[PDB]
């Protein structure tokens, strides 16, 4: 475990904060909602035309959203290399630049890489807003007028709960706090030991690895609440009273929320799965150094 070899954990949100871009495919949670709406349209004959939208408008968007990330892939490799010299003290010695000047480039390169993923999909952002609005216009095709049946909407919730049951939320909840406790235990130790040791290169390499680790935990913690918000609300609707027939315009709002809430759960599960693997990996790096720190002070 010399250095980190995966940097798929970075993400960025727009200023309006409605859209979160992840490096993991589909890169957008709304595509998962679009994929999940296709399940809705299969049961209703009136929305059978939606398959053309999915075959063309949404499928091209996934390929187009993925391509915009590829332009940032080259800038990603530039940033990725900067971490390796910063995190490894023996590699940092060859560079022989100040720790702060090497840190300043990283911070500017961190936003620049963050900025590329955000800026390249800006034209794509208007598309996802255009697709789901088109689906709102398509939902006027249902042959109901204040008598829309809620069966299909409710048969999906009992199936979703089973899909909800597969993911173990409680194991993830234990993972973060214990790791975050070790994160705390590392940092508060460093603030008092930095005065004790005179060489900073080895402890600065940790201090960087710790600072980046703190960034990774927030992405895990943020997604966990949204997955927790997705399990709670969908489960609460199953607890709530179920009417067979609702308004046409209201059924549109019914369909959107479950797919909206479910898409975040699907999206969070992918990021949560990757984030812990990067979290335990950074924990593996912080510890191979801790052994290197103690041995040198002995002699």
């Amino acid at each position: 475990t010399n250095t980190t070899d995966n940097i798929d954990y970075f993400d960025i949100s727009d200023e309006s904060n409605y859209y979160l871009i992840s490096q993991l495919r589909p890169h957008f949670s709304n595509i998962y909602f679009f994929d999940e709406f296709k399940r809705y349209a299969s049961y209703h004959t009136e929305i059978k035309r939606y398959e053309d939208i999915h075959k063309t408008k949404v499928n091209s968007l996934l390929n187009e959203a993925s391509r915009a990330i590829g332009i940032c892939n080259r800038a990603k490799n530039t940033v990725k290399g900067l971490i390796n010299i910063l995190e490894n003290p023996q590699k940092f010695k060859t560079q022989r630049e100040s720790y702060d000047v090497k840190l300043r480039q990283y911070e500017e390169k961190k936003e620049a890489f963050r900025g590329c993923l955000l800026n390249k999909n800006r034209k794509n952002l208007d598309q996802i807003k255009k697709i789901n609005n088109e689906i709102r216009d398509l939902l006027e095709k249902l042959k109901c007028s204040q008598d829309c049946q809620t069966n299909v909407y409710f048969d999906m919730i009992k199936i979703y709960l089973v899909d909800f049951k597969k993911m173990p939320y409680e194991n993830y909840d234990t993972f973060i706090k214990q790791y975050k406790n070790s994160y705390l235990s590392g940092v508060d130790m460093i603030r008092k030991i930095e005065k004790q040791i005179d060489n900073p290169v080895t402890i600065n390499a940790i201090k960087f690895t710790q600072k980046e680790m703190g960034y990774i935990i927030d992405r895990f913690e943020y997604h966990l609440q949204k997955v927790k918000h997705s399990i709670d609300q969908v489960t609460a609707l199953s607890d709530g009273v179920k009417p067979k027939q609702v308004t046409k315009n209201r059924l549109k709002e019914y369909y959107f929320n479950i797919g909206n809430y479910y898409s975040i759960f699907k999206f969070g599960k992918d990021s949560l799965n990757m984030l812990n693997k990067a979290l335990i990996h950074k924990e593996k790096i912080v510890h191979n150094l801790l052994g290197e720190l103690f041995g040198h002070l002995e002699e």
Epitope: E46, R49, D52, K57, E134, D137, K141, L142, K143
Partner: antibody
């Protein structure tokens, strides 16, 4: 700036086909909206002719007209194309180029082209 | 597949006027209304019975669900077509020309 649809003649043709129609779209993104044509007769507009998907892969033809009509669309040049074979005195028509919403309603209409088929 | 229309109607400026369209197998909200001038292209003002496009004067309204539909307009200055876009074929009503009393 303004959404509009232009059309080609039109005019007298012989029963043995020999007629093609084109349509120009401007002021909007061609790819997002479907493209349909509509047929017209003195007493009309009941009958409707084909429409073409965004990609251009799937198209629906009138059962009566499926054998003698082919539709195509040029997304690149913003052109909607109609192909007719073995024209008949029933095919005599005015044709209005239309934009088709997702709800299959025709939100915008072209100026129209008048076709006459006889001997 | 379903289609109806009715005979022409005669009204004068300026009163409210209904146009009657029925048909045979419930299309729900799936109806469209187009206005055709005597020598100009058809223009769509009403889709889904109760919804009107932009660029459509406020006097034009629509109503009805299921099998029967009507179009009422409060004021007046030609021929109007009701359509089902729900299922193939997508047929318009024969249309009712408008005349002015005198």
């Amino acid at each position: 700036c303004e959404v509009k649809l232009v059309e080609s003649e039109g005019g007298l043709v012989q029963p043995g086909s020999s007629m093609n129609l084109s349509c120009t779209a401007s002021g909007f993104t061609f790819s997002d909206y479907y493209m349909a044509w509509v047929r017209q007769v003195p007493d009309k507009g009941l009958e409707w002719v084909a429409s073409v998907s965004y990609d251009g892969s799937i198209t629906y033809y009138l059962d009566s007209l499926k054998s003698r009509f082919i539709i195509s669309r040029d997304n690149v040049k913003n052109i909607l194309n109609l192909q007719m074979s073995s024209l008949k005195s029933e095919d005599t028509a005015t044709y209005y180029c239309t934009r088709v919403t997702v709800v299959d309603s025709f939100d915008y209409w072209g100026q129209g082209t008048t076709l006459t088929v006889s001997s | 597949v379903m289609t109806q229309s009715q005979k022409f109607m005669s009204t004068s400026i300026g009163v409210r006027v209904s146009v009657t369209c029925k048909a045979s197998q419930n299309v729900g909200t799936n109806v469209a209304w187009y206005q055709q001038k005597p020598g100009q292209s058809p223009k769509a003002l009403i889709y889904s019975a109760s919804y009107r496009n932009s660029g459509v004067p406020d006097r034009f309204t629509g109503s009805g669900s299921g099998t029967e539909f009507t179009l009422t307009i409060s004021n007046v200055q030609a021929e109007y077509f009701c359509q089902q876009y729900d299922s193939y074929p997508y047929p318009f009503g024969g249309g009712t020309k408008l005349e002015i009393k005198r």
